[PDB]
Design a protein around this ligand. Structure first.
Ligand code: SF4
Ligand code: SF4
Ligand code: FES
Ligand code: FES
Ligand SMILES: [Fe+3]
Ligand SMILES: [Fe+3]
Lengths: 633, 633
């Protein structure tokens, strides 16, 4: 079972699933072996009804697509569509939040409001929206309208690219024609250019994909911006993670998906309803998080994280999960079938994300509190039906200190230097206490024993004094293995890094260090790491491709994560990936993405299966950046 | 060779390609056999890096995707993305024309202008744009701005859906939530909902696809609208088709692709340059058409059609094609490799559609005449290099009467009834002279002997008095086999149909009938058949799913054609397809698309391999509609 997951709670539920005959993601993976080598290498195309076409990676025919498409065109077209799909997910999330903010300040959804007035005004300043003499509701309406305008062509490019990156970076991108004209405009243009008998030049195609990945960055950044306005900017919090946060005597309700627009309301209304749950025999309503919508309410409210990604079925296997409330993205559709065995009420809430066999509740922001009550009452009914039923909740959980928004990080640093908060961080980079910065991002993948790459790489970087920040299911992996617990700083961190975490924590009224890893939030909150790295770059007067900053999508899965990895390279970062993407069938495309993209953006993909080898390559990349600044290493 | 193409000129060039060792699309198809059965059935998914996943159509495992996706989810997701890709192609074409019209009336591209003032004003009326007291350039600017606004969400739905379909049809679509909110909005939403861990309900997924297909209809209709404003509404013309329109002593220049924005200019400037071509020893510049941009300038200017679709390489094999001028879509990238053997100068012109090994000329509307000259001079240089070289142009061509825009059809009918032009057509439907209407649309496909389905089905429908209209490469197939020559009416048409074609032609100052098939233009000009059928429906006071009107995408290939077939079903038409789409792996999805979609839109797909059987099923569908109106049959 430790070949499936390094998480001991997950291993325990795998034993239970095995003996109850419940099929899991790992079983479905095993039944799929051996996987198709054409798809694995990227040498398959189904973009027209003359296909499917394939190309032998080596040997005799087929050597070319029926229309004449070469291996390098087929590979670049397939990658481009996965970037566009990722952009469409992060774009759709941001768009829904834009409509919510607009409804809120137009008096149409009273359950929503401007919660962070500081954030609203700083965004409006960043966009060049006039604030002084304006009402908040009119500033916010201007911000929401500007958000919606970035989806289509207009007289400006996408402002959620051009106003978030260092001006030098924008000029480098603009010189290569890489600035997006509109978010949905770029998504559609990718789909057009990759359809049959259109773009057939690998380099032209990949430049389109880099541009589409910045459309995805815009959507990430807009989603983070709008969610902070509506629900508050995260600040440091303490909570717990892993399956042991479930409680047998409570109504256990998981929020699962990505968009917190309803899950933040569920959090609020669930407090309002403890009495109704006590009347059914529960201690209360135990809201817990799965995947990124769980990260959202962990970051803002300290909702304990139940589990993540590949292991999400295991929360049901406990027998104690009474409801699973879904919005969209990364939800294994298997949860709807598994619920018939485990008793869980699986509930979809979004018009464009339904699952056959789940109960659907048509959430509308105008009726959000009423919907949350209808939903939580289904959860209460479910808890009643398992009166007397035995549960197996693994008694396994970790302490999690989280909530490190970029504003929180700057604020924490300001306690060492009030008027120059970034300087203490840069000082310890220069003198070697901080070797560099590594962002862990992206999913788990069934192909990789769960969390194995994240923890192995992080363990080695931390001992080498790398400052480690994490998002999404990378934060999930680290948090479930103790990397967000300050009590483990002594074990995990080098002396230089420990010294810095201790000074910052001691200066923030804690008598203890910051945690070994800084949790910066959900996948769209990868935009927070951009805001931090960009601010560091602007303070040093250099572009991002000169900073000792790297990223590792160590176990990545989703098209969303492919987009993120690509815009990490596009904004200038050495970017490690721990699962082969479908590009090895084309050496020219692999060469572009792993080497020659350096000459365009200064970033590049680092393709490494072995996590120990990956850590060495990440340290080498961090150290080359150090040498380019003339730092010792 | 007749197993590859029923076109005798194509067969002759296949012999030449074979003996010169030049590989063709048919050779590349043969080298790809046997094709992958998982892809053929739709039972493959690569939407995340845990894949590729596949499902055995029958037998033991794998039975489900790794994430839990069922066969019906995987099949519906794959179809949805092909619809979105099609929508993005027709959308991009329309969008480029919208920007061109805006540049033209803003004084920025003097090579473009309002050429059809009648069309501009009728579109503006249809959209509710005020005309009286307004300048043309300000009406047109309003029309262009409204075109661009249909790509994103606004306070109205896509007007290029709601103002083009009968009001009853709009209410039926609106009741099922099928009206698009924005063209690129729907494309992105499809990409989101079909990414991993999102929509997992076949019916929900397919309803999204029907809505996205109407986004494609909007783009088709907008593209036709804008092209008519800019370049003129087609009116009946006489020309020729097939490889024999090439001339050994001329500079033979093919316009190839879909967007006529440059190819219409090439037509104009090529006249301006006969002397420069004569100075190099040519008789002149012989502009000919390939695929839909060729249809565009055939419809408006009588440019002879050289060839289409699957056979496009054959035009090069003659040795006489000096230049091939490409915009985008349906261009076999093989033309760039083949040119090294045949001497042809292959020229790309659009930023997002390049082909490795082709010469790229960066066309801009602001510099259109200068670009056309640079391009035509490359063609002249090429003609010089083949001085004395022998060519093999098959002496095979047909007479083509074309240009039947919906306005041209109404005008032609008006000569039988000035104030009620549709009535003569409806009269002969009622009394049986016209059994019904069949639209042939879409591509050729290497899987089907070229043109075999189109001609076989058309031959049987025409003898049964069906009025046949055609677009795209369906018009190409019919025109290259003599179906657009009035001299063949006696051979091809039933007595009822012949009587009507004769009366209309005789009443239009011809002493001869209309051609056996009415050529209504390019693939976006499928919107013209919609405008005609909608006008017929509005005149009878019924919805389109009550008219004896069918469609046949008899040899379809492109994702664009998948979108068209889907919106033909969505607007209510029985729609035959001649190549299996990747849906047979899911019986529930096949049942929805072939039967139960009837209960939503009244249209349905007719899946039939055998063209003789297809003609019977199309006649049966036409005759059931007749019976529903109480007509004899
Ligand atoms: S687009 Fe080309 S390579 Fe892809 S399926 Fe069609 S013929 Fe094959
Ligand atoms: S989305 Fe599901 S079915 Fe598709 S590749 Fe990923 S795991 Fe497999
Ligand atoms: S041949 Fe297996 S992915 Fe297409
Ligand atoms: S297994 Fe062949 S199309 Fe994927
Ligand atoms: Fe996740
Ligand atoms: Fe074509």
């Amino acid at each position: 079972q430790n070949l499936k997951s390094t998480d001991r709670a997950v291993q325990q539920m795998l034993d239970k699933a095995k003996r109850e005959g419940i099929q899991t993601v790992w079983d479905r993976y095993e039944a799929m072996k051996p996987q198709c080598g054409f798809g694995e290498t990227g040498l398959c195309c189904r973009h027209c009804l003359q296909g499917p076409c394939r190309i032998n990676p080596f040997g005799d025919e087929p050597k070319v697509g029926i229309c004449g498409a070469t291996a390098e065109v087929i590979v670049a077209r397939g990658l481009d569509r996965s970037i566009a799909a990722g952009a469409a997910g992060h774009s759709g999330h941001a768009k829904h939040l834009a409509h919510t903010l607009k409804k809120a300040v137009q008096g149409k959804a009273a359950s929503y409001m401007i919660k962070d007035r500081t954030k609203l005004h700083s965004i409006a300043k960043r966009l060049g929206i006039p604030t002084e003499g304006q009402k908040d509701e009119d500033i916010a309406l201007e911000v929401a309208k500007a958000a919606l305008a970035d989806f289509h062509e207009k007289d400006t490019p996408v402002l959620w690219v051009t106003t978030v990156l260092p001006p030098s970076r924008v000029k480098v991108l603009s010189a290569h024609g890489l600035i997006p004209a509109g978010i949905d405009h770029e998504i559609a243009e990718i789909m057009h250019r990759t359809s049959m008998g259109c773009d057939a030049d690998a380099q032209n195609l990949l430049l389109g994909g880099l541009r589409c990945s910045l459309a995805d960055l815009a959507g990430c950044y807009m989603g983070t911006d709008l969610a902070d306005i509506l629900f508050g900017t995260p600040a440091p919090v303490v909570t717990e993670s892993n399956l042991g946060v479930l409680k047998a005597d409570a109504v256990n309700v998981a929020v699962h998906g990505h968009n917190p627009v309803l899950s933040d309301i569920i959090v609020s209304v669930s407090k309002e309803m403890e009495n109704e749950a006590r009347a059914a025999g529960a201690t209360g309503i135990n809201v817990v998080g799965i995947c990124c919508t769980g990260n959202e309410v962990l970051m803002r409210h300290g909702i304990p994280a139940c589990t993540h990604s590949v292991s999400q079925e295991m929360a049901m296997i406990t027998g104690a999960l009474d409801a699973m409330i879904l919005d969209y993205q990364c939800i294994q559709p298997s949860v709807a079938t598994i619920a018939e065995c485990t008793g869980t009420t699986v509930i979809t809430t979004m018009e464009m994300s339904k699952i056959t066999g789940a109960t659907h509740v048509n959430f509308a922001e105008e009726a959000a509190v009423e919907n949350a009550k209808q939903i939580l009452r289904l959860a209460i009914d479910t808890f009643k039906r398992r009166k007397g039923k035995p549960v197996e909740i693994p008694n396994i959980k970790t302490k999690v200190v989280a909530g490190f928004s970029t504003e929180a990080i700057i604020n924490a640093l300001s306690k060492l230097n009030a008027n120059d908060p970034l300087k203490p961080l840069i000082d310890n980079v220069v003198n070697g206490n901080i070797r560099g910065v590594c962002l862990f991002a992206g999913c788990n993948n069934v192909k990789v024993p769960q969390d194995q790459n994240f923890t192995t790489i992080a363990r080695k970087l931390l001992k080498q004094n790398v400052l480690v920040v994490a998002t999404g299911c990378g934060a999930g992996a680290l948090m479930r293995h103790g990397f967000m617990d300050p009590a483990n700083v002594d074990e995990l961190c080098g002396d230089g890094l420990k010294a810095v975490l201790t000074a910052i924590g001691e200066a923030n009224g804690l008598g203890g260090p910051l945690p070994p890893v800084l949790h910066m939030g959900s996948c769209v909150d990868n935009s927070r790491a951009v805001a931090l790295v960009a601010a560091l770059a602007n303070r040093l007067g250099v572009d991002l491709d000169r900073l000792p900053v790297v990223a590792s999508a160590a176990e990545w899965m989703h098209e969303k994560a492919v987009a993120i990895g690509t815009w990490a390279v596009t904004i200038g970062l050495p970017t490690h990936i721990g699962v082969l993407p479908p590009i090895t069938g084309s050496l020219p495309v692999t060469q572009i993405l792993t080497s020659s993209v350096k000459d365009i953006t200064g970033g590049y993909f680092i393709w490494e299966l072995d996590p120990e080898t990956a850590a060495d390559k990440l340290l080498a990349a961090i150290n080359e950046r150090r040498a380019g600044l003339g730092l010792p290493w």
